[PDB]
Amino acid sequence: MTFSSTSNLKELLRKVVLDVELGREQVQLLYKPIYDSIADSNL
Amino acid sequence: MTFSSTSNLKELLRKVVLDVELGREQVQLLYKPIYDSIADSNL
């Protein structure tokens, strides 16, 4: 009858999350084509 | 004997409908490529 009445009492209502992209952007390895890598552990 | 005498008596005169395009434009859902849809009855 009076959903406006029950709107304020939020804890009754279902909780659903508006899914949005959050989080820091992924990072890449840009340098690699320029550099020649040597990976001897005994350096 | 004039044809104007029989003008008013439309029942006597043969009836032919002037064929023509009547109607209204069909509406379309333009938004859909832009928006990403989430469907849930419990929102």
Tab-separated table of N, CA, C and O in Angstrom:
chain	number	residue	atom	x	y	z
A	1	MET	N	0.848	-1.222	0.000
A	1	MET	CA	0.000	0.000	0.000
A	1	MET	C	0.870	1.255	0.000
A	1	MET	O	0.629	2.181	-0.769
A	2	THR	N	1.895	1.268	0.847
A	2	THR	CA	2.612	2.486	1.210
A	2	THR	C	4.114	2.271	1.127
A	2	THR	O	4.846	2.509	2.090
A	3	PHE	N	4.596	1.796	-0.027
A	3	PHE	CA	6.026	1.536	-0.178
A	3	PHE	C	6.858	2.781	0.098
A	3	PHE	O	8.012	2.670	0.523
A	4	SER	N	6.299	3.967	-0.144
A	4	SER	CA	6.973	5.189	0.271
A	4	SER	C	7.218	5.202	1.772
A	4	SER	O	8.237	5.728	2.229
A	5	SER	N	6.298	4.639	2.556
A	5	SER	CA	6.500	4.578	3.998
A	5	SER	C	7.684	3.692	4.359
A	5	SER	O	8.496	4.053	5.217
A	6	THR	N	7.805	2.534	3.714
A	6	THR	CA	8.865	1.584	4.029
A	6	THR	C	10.178	1.890	3.323
A	6	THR	O	11.163	1.190	3.571
A	7	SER	N	10.219	2.892	2.445
A	7	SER	CA	11.455	3.181	1.727
A	7	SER	C	12.552	3.640	2.677
A	7	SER	O	13.718	3.269	2.513
A	8	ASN	N	12.197	4.454	3.673
A	8	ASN	CA	13.203	4.990	4.584
A	8	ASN	C	13.885	3.887	5.379
A	8	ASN	O	15.100	3.928	5.594
A	9	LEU	N	13.124	2.891	5.821
A	9	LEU	CA	13.672	1.803	6.627
A	9	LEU	C	14.481	0.904	5.698
A	9	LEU	O	14.043	-0.162	5.263
A	10	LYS	N	15.702	1.355	5.402
A	10	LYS	CA	16.476	0.759	4.319
A	10	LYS	C	16.832	-0.692	4.595
A	10	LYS	O	16.877	-1.503	3.664
A	11	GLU	N	17.085	-1.041	5.855
A	11	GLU	CA	17.600	-2.370	6.166
A	11	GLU	C	16.632	-3.475	5.773
A	11	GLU	O	17.057	-4.619	5.584
A	12	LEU	N	15.341	-3.165	5.655
A	12	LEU	CA	14.392	-4.138	5.129
A	12	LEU	C	14.710	-4.484	3.682
A	12	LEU	O	14.620	-5.649	3.279
A	13	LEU	N	15.075	-3.484	2.888
A	13	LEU	CA	15.198	-3.671	1.451
A	13	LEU	C	16.357	-4.595	1.121
A	13	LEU	O	17.340	-4.685	1.858
A	14	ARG	N	16.232	-5.291	-0.002
A	14	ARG	CA	17.342	-6.084	-0.502
A	14	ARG	C	18.514	-5.175	-0.838
A	14	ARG	O	18.334	-4.058	-1.326
A	15	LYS	N	19.719	-5.661	-0.562
A	15	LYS	CA	20.949	-4.958	-0.896
A	15	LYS	C	21.537	-5.586	-2.151
A	15	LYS	O	21.883	-6.771	-2.149
A	16	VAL	N	21.632	-4.798	-3.218
A	16	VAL	CA	22.243	-5.229	-4.468
A	16	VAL	C	23.259	-4.180	-4.881
A	16	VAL	O	22.996	-2.975	-4.792
A	17	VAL	N	24.420	-4.639	-5.326
A	17	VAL	CA	25.532	-3.760	-5.648
A	17	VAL	C	25.498	-3.442	-7.134
A	17	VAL	O	25.442	-4.346	-7.974
A	18	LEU	N	25.532	-2.155	-7.455
A	18	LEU	CA	25.654	-1.694	-8.834
A	18	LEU	C	27.072	-1.976	-9.300
A	18	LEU	O	28.005	-1.252	-8.952
A	19	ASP	N	27.245	-3.030	-10.088
A	19	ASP	CA	28.582	-3.460	-10.476
A	19	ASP	C	29.216	-2.436	-11.408
A	19	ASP	O	28.691	-2.161	-12.490
A	20	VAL	N	30.348	-1.880	-10.985
A	20	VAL	CA	31.091	-0.896	-11.760
A	20	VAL	C	32.570	-1.233	-11.661
A	20	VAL	O	33.042	-1.748	-10.644
A	21	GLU	N	33.301	-0.943	-12.732
A	21	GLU	CA	34.739	-1.163	-12.743
A	21	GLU	C	35.425	-0.302	-11.692
A	21	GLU	O	35.466	0.926	-11.820
A	22	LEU	N	35.953	-0.937	-10.652
A	22	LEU	CA	36.784	-0.288	-9.651
A	22	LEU	C	38.122	-1.004	-9.591
A	22	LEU	O	38.230	-2.179	-9.953
A	23	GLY	N	39.137	-0.279	-9.137
A	23	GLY	CA	40.478	-0.813	-9.034
A	23	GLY	C	41.441	-0.099	-9.952
A	23	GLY	O	41.052	0.416	-11.003
A	24	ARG	N	42.706	-0.058	-9.555
A	24	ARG	CA	43.715	0.610	-10.357
A	24	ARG	C	43.943	-0.153	-11.654
A	24	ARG	O	43.831	-1.380	-11.701
A	25	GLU	N	44.248	0.587	-12.713
A	25	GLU	CA	44.388	-0.011	-14.030
A	25	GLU	C	45.602	-0.927	-14.078
A	25	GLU	O	46.586	-0.729	-13.364
A	26	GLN	N	45.522	-1.945	-14.929
A	26	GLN	CA	46.621	-2.887	-15.056
A	26	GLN	C	47.861	-2.198	-15.611
A	26	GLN	O	47.774	-1.279	-16.428
A	27	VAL	N	49.023	-2.656	-15.152
A	27	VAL	CA	50.315	-2.114	-15.554
A	27	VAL	C	50.989	-3.125	-16.470
A	27	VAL	O	50.797	-4.339	-16.335
A	28	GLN	N	51.781	-2.615	-17.410
A	28	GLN	CA	52.432	-3.411	-18.440
A	28	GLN	C	53.945	-3.245	-18.369
A	28	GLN	O	54.471	-2.402	-17.640
A	29	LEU	N	54.640	-4.078	-19.145
A	29	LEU	CA	56.094	-4.020	-19.288
A	29	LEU	C	56.397	-3.413	-20.654
A	29	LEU	O	56.544	-4.116	-21.654
A	30	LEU	N	56.489	-2.086	-20.689
A	30	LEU	CA	56.736	-1.379	-21.939
A	30	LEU	C	58.190	-1.464	-22.380
A	30	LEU	O	58.465	-1.486	-23.582
A	31	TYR	N	59.130	-1.498	-21.434
A	31	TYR	CA	60.540	-1.355	-21.769
A	31	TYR	C	61.081	-2.509	-22.603
A	31	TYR	O	62.090	-2.326	-23.289
A	32	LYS	N	60.441	-3.678	-22.559
A	32	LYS	CA	61.124	-4.911	-22.946
A	32	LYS	C	61.657	-4.933	-24.375
A	32	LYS	O	62.778	-5.435	-24.568
A	33	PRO	N	60.940	-4.457	-25.399
A	33	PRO	CA	61.534	-4.455	-26.749
A	33	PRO	C	62.839	-3.686	-26.848
A	33	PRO	O	63.741	-4.107	-27.580
A	34	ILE	N	62.972	-2.572	-26.128
A	34	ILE	CA	64.207	-1.801	-26.198
A	34	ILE	C	65.373	-2.600	-25.630
A	34	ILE	O	66.456	-2.644	-26.223
A	35	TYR	N	65.178	-3.237	-24.484
A	35	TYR	CA	66.282	-3.812	-23.731
A	35	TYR	C	66.567	-5.247	-24.147
A	35	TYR	O	65.667	-5.999	-24.529
A	36	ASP	N	67.844	-5.612	-24.077
A	36	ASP	CA	68.283	-6.997	-24.160
A	36	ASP	C	68.550	-7.487	-22.744
A	36	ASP	O	69.361	-6.897	-22.026
A	37	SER	N	67.869	-8.557	-22.348
A	37	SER	CA	67.927	-9.049	-20.979
A	37	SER	C	68.875	-10.235	-20.882
A	37	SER	O	68.848	-11.131	-21.731
A	38	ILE	N	69.716	-10.225	-19.852
A	38	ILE	CA	70.511	-11.380	-19.457
A	38	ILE	C	70.122	-11.728	-18.029
A	38	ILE	O	70.063	-10.844	-17.164
A	39	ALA	N	69.847	-13.010	-17.793
A	39	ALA	CA	69.243	-13.462	-16.547
A	39	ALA	C	70.067	-14.561	-15.894
A	39	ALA	O	69.521	-15.588	-15.480
A	40	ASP	N	71.378	-14.364	-15.804
A	40	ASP	CA	72.225	-15.278	-15.051
A	40	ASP	C	72.084	-14.968	-13.569
A	40	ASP	O	72.362	-13.846	-13.135
A	41	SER	N	71.652	-15.962	-12.794
A	41	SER	CA	71.483	-15.765	-11.361
A	41	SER	C	72.801	-15.498	-10.649
A	41	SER	O	72.793	-14.914	-9.561
A	42	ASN	N	73.925	-15.905	-11.234
A	42	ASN	CA	75.229	-15.788	-10.602
A	42	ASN	C	75.934	-14.483	-10.944
A	42	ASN	O	77.167	-14.426	-10.895
A	43	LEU	N	75.190	-13.440	-11.292
A	43	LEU	CA	75.818	-12.171	-11.598
A	43	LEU	C	76.468	-11.609	-10.334
A	43	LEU	O	76.044	-11.934	-9.224
B	1	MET	N	-30.219	13.273	-69.988
B	1	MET	CA	-30.234	12.884	-68.549
B	1	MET	C	-28.848	13.025	-67.934
B	1	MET	O	-27.953	12.227	-68.205
B	2	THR	N	-28.683	14.040	-67.094
B	2	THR	CA	-27.373	14.354	-66.549
B	2	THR	C	-26.890	13.263	-65.603
B	2	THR	O	-27.678	12.592	-64.932
B	3	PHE	N	-25.570	13.083	-65.569
B	3	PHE	CA	-24.949	12.268	-64.534
B	3	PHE	C	-24.964	12.965	-63.181
B	3	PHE	O	-24.852	12.294	-62.152
B	4	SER	N	-25.101	14.295	-63.161
B	4	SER	CA	-25.128	15.020	-61.896
B	4	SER	C	-26.329	14.629	-61.049
B	4	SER	O	-26.286	14.748	-59.820
B	5	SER	N	-27.413	14.184	-61.684
B	5	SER	CA	-28.575	13.732	-60.931
B	5	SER	C	-28.226	12.543	-60.048
B	5	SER	O	-28.688	12.452	-58.906
B	6	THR	N	-27.411	11.626	-60.558
B	6	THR	CA	-26.998	10.442	-59.821
B	6	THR	C	-25.752	10.676	-58.976
B	6	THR	O	-25.232	9.722	-58.389
B	7	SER	N	-25.256	11.913	-58.908
B	7	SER	CA	-24.048	12.184	-58.136
B	7	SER	C	-24.262	11.892	-56.658
B	7	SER	O	-23.457	11.197	-56.030
B	8	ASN	N	-25.353	12.405	-56.089
B	8	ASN	CA	-25.557	12.293	-54.649
B	8	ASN	C	-25.763	10.846	-54.224
B	8	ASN	O	-25.305	10.439	-53.152
B	9	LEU	N	-26.438	10.051	-55.052
B	9	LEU	CA	-26.770	8.673	-54.696
B	9	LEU	C	-25.511	7.823	-54.832
B	9	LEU	O	-25.325	7.063	-55.786
B	10	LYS	N	-24.634	7.951	-53.834
B	10	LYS	CA	-23.359	7.243	-53.865
B	10	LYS	C	-23.552	5.734	-53.890
B	10	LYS	O	-22.688	5.008	-54.391
B	11	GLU	N	-24.670	5.246	-53.354
B	11	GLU	CA	-24.926	3.812	-53.365
B	11	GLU	C	-25.019	3.285	-54.788
B	11	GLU	O	-24.477	2.219	-55.102
B	12	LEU	N	-25.705	4.018	-55.664
B	12	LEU	CA	-25.829	3.582	-57.049
B	12	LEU	C	-24.475	3.579	-57.745
B	12	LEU	O	-24.137	2.628	-58.459
B	13	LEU	N	-23.685	4.628	-57.542
B	13	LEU	CA	-22.394	4.728	-58.203
B	13	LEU	C	-21.418	3.727	-57.602
B	13	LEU	O	-21.377	3.531	-56.385
B	14	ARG	N	-20.633	3.088	-58.465
B	14	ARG	CA	-19.623	2.149	-57.998
B	14	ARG	C	-18.601	2.866	-57.126
B	14	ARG	O	-18.228	4.011	-57.392
B	15	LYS	N	-18.148	2.179	-56.081
B	15	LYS	CA	-17.203	2.719	-55.113
B	15	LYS	C	-15.849	2.049	-55.293
B	15	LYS	O	-15.762	0.817	-55.336
B	16	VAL	N	-14.803	2.864	-55.412
B	16	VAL	CA	-13.425	2.396	-55.491
B	16	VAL	C	-12.590	3.247	-54.548
B	16	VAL	O	-12.718	4.476	-54.536
B	17	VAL	N	-11.741	2.597	-53.767
B	17	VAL	CA	-10.930	3.274	-52.765
B	17	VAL	C	-9.609	3.694	-53.389
B	17	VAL	O	-8.946	2.911	-54.079
B	18	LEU	N	-9.232	4.946	-53.158
B	18	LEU	CA	-7.968	5.481	-53.655
B	18	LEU	C	-6.834	4.866	-52.851
B	18	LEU	O	-6.563	5.283	-51.725
B	19	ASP	N	-6.170	3.865	-53.427
B	19	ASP	CA	-5.115	3.165	-52.708
B	19	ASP	C	-3.982	4.119	-52.361
B	19	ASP	O	-3.543	4.917	-53.192
B	20	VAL	N	-3.511	4.037	-51.118
B	20	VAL	CA	-2.512	4.970	-50.614
B	20	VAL	C	-1.878	4.354	-49.378
B	20	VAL	O	-2.440	3.451	-48.759
B	21	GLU	N	-0.693	4.842	-49.020
B	21	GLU	CA	0.042	4.326	-47.870
B	21	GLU	C	-0.413	5.062	-46.616
B	21	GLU	O	-0.127	6.252	-46.450
B	22	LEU	N	-1.115	4.355	-45.733
B	22	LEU	CA	-1.547	4.884	-44.448
B	22	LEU	C	-0.970	4.020	-43.340
B	22	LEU	O	-0.903	2.794	-43.465
B	23	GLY	N	-0.554	4.665	-42.266
B	23	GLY	CA	0.075	3.982	-41.159
B	23	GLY	C	0.902	4.964	-40.359
B	23	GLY	O	0.803	6.174	-40.538
B	24	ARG	N	1.716	4.410	-39.463
B	24	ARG	CA	2.621	5.204	-38.648
B	24	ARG	C	3.949	4.476	-38.522
B	24	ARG	O	4.010	3.245	-38.571
B	25	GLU	N	5.012	5.260	-38.361
B	25	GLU	CA	6.363	4.718	-38.381
B	25	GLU	C	6.575	3.743	-37.232
B	25	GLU	O	6.033	3.917	-36.139
B	26	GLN	N	7.371	2.711	-37.488
B	26	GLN	CA	7.733	1.761	-36.449
B	26	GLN	C	8.895	2.310	-35.633
B	26	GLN	O	9.921	2.707	-36.190
B	27	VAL	N	8.735	2.327	-34.322
B	27	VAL	CA	9.773	2.807	-33.420
B	27	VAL	C	10.776	1.682	-33.218
B	27	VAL	O	10.438	0.501	-33.330
B	28	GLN	N	12.025	2.051	-32.938
B	28	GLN	CA	13.117	1.103	-32.790
B	28	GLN	C	13.920	1.426	-31.540
B	28	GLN	O	13.929	2.558	-31.050
B	29	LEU	N	14.601	0.405	-31.030
B	29	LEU	CA	15.405	0.512	-29.818
B	29	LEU	C	16.817	0.913	-30.230
B	29	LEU	O	17.649	0.063	-30.553
B	30	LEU	N	17.082	2.219	-30.222
B	30	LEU	CA	18.397	2.715	-30.605
B	30	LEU	C	19.431	2.525	-29.504
B	30	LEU	O	20.612	2.322	-29.800
B	31	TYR	N	19.008	2.588	-28.243
B	31	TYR	CA	19.947	2.674	-27.131
B	31	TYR	C	20.835	1.442	-27.007
B	31	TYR	O	21.963	1.556	-26.515
B	32	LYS	N	20.362	0.278	-27.457
B	32	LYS	CA	20.886	-0.990	-26.949
B	32	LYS	C	22.390	-1.184	-27.104
B	32	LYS	O	23.009	-1.707	-26.161
B	33	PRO	N	23.027	-0.841	-28.225
B	33	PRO	CA	24.491	-0.979	-28.281
B	33	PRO	C	25.217	-0.178	-27.216
B	33	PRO	O	26.241	-0.637	-26.700
B	34	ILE	N	24.713	1.002	-26.859
B	34	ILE	CA	25.383	1.805	-25.843
B	34	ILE	C	25.318	1.114	-24.488
B	34	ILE	O	26.345	0.870	-23.848
B	35	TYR	N	24.116	0.773	-24.037
B	35	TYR	CA	23.925	0.322	-22.669
B	35	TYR	C	24.206	-1.165	-22.538
B	35	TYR	O	23.957	-1.951	-23.454
B	36	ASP	N	24.740	-1.539	-21.380
B	36	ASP	CA	24.878	-2.931	-20.978
B	36	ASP	C	23.762	-3.258	-20.000
B	36	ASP	O	23.596	-2.566	-18.991
B	37	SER	N	23.001	-4.302	-20.302
B	37	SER	CA	21.774	-4.604	-19.581
B	37	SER	C	22.037	-5.629	-18.492
B	37	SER	O	22.737	-6.620	-18.721
B	38	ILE	N	21.478	-5.379	-17.312
B	38	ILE	CA	21.424	-6.352	-16.230
B	38	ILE	C	19.962	-6.519	-15.848
B	38	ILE	O	19.268	-5.533	-15.553
B	39	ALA	N	19.495	-7.764	-15.881
B	39	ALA	CA	18.099	-8.108	-15.663
B	39	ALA	C	17.992	-8.924	-14.386
B	39	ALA	O	18.629	-9.974	-14.260
B	40	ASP	N	17.186	-8.441	-13.449
B	40	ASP	CA	16.981	-9.135	-12.184
B	40	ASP	C	15.694	-8.609	-11.579
B	40	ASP	O	15.570	-7.405	-11.344
B	41	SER	N	14.746	-9.507	-11.317
B	41	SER	CA	13.451	-9.087	-10.800
B	41	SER	C	13.536	-8.507	-9.394
B	41	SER	O	12.589	-7.847	-8.957
B	42	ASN	N	14.643	-8.719	-8.687
B	42	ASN	CA	14.750	-8.380	-7.278
B	42	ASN	C	15.432	-7.041	-7.035
B	42	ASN	O	15.749	-6.724	-5.886
B	43	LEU	N	15.667	-6.252	-8.074
B	43	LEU	CA	16.395	-5.005	-7.894
B	43	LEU	C	15.688	-4.013	-6.969
B	43	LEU	O	14.466	-3.859	-7.037
